[PDB]
Amino acid sequence: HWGYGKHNGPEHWHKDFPIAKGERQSPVDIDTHTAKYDPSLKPLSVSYDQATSLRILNNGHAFNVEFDDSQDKAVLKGGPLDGTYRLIQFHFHWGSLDGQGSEHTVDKKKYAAELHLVHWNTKYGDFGKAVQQPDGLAVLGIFLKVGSAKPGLQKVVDVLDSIKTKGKSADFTNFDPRGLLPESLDYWTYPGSLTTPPLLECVTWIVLKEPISVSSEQVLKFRKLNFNGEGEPEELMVDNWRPAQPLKNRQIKASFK
Ligand SMILES: Cc1ccc(O)c(S)c1
Ligand SMILES: [Zn+2]
Structure with a gap:
């Protein structure tokens, strides 16, 4: 089945998921000079004060921090969005080397x-x-650079050794995703897709301009995770990013001048 290696990586996904060569695939390169400022974008509203994390899971492709989405808590609205979108999970994509890892590029x-x-x-x-649905998801994308540590990330890094391999989960309550946000909510937005199979075209992407800084030690710990299950040959969970896809008939809009 699908993954990130030579035989089952991004260049292969189209055979099981033909929408891989669809009209609004993600990620894309964000050309900052041609992304036009849109003064009709309303400001973005991130309301995470009541977020209830539950668990962290190694799914064999990344790890997910999962939230109780059974009530009106942890919502994103405003920006390009009509209506209210509820947080269900977050995850990361990262590289084997500090020079690569992100899915969108700028x-x-x-x-x-x-x-x-x-x-x-x-x-x-x-x-x-x-x-x-074509407006079913909103994904807030935030870039990580290596420099100073992100204190709000540490509780995640410290739990990873308990979910080393595919299928492992761990209780993960009371994690506050506000600690993962940069200062500014200036963003670019465009219509796209999941960046992993099944590649569904449901996503309004909201990609923050300001990266957060994480330390080299924090990212090194992501790279100790495994794509394989326990008892299987070790394959480090690195380079779980899809490269940029054709922009096709899309415009990327900037929330800022
Ligand atoms: C499950 C899932 C939801 C949204 C996403 O952008 C990705 S990459 C994966
Ligand atoms: Zn993703």
């Missing part, structure tokens, strides 16, 4: 990793019905 620059905070449009009732 004027072809690759960051060391990228955070995806995944939210579903509450008008569709749950995640599974929302990924059947």
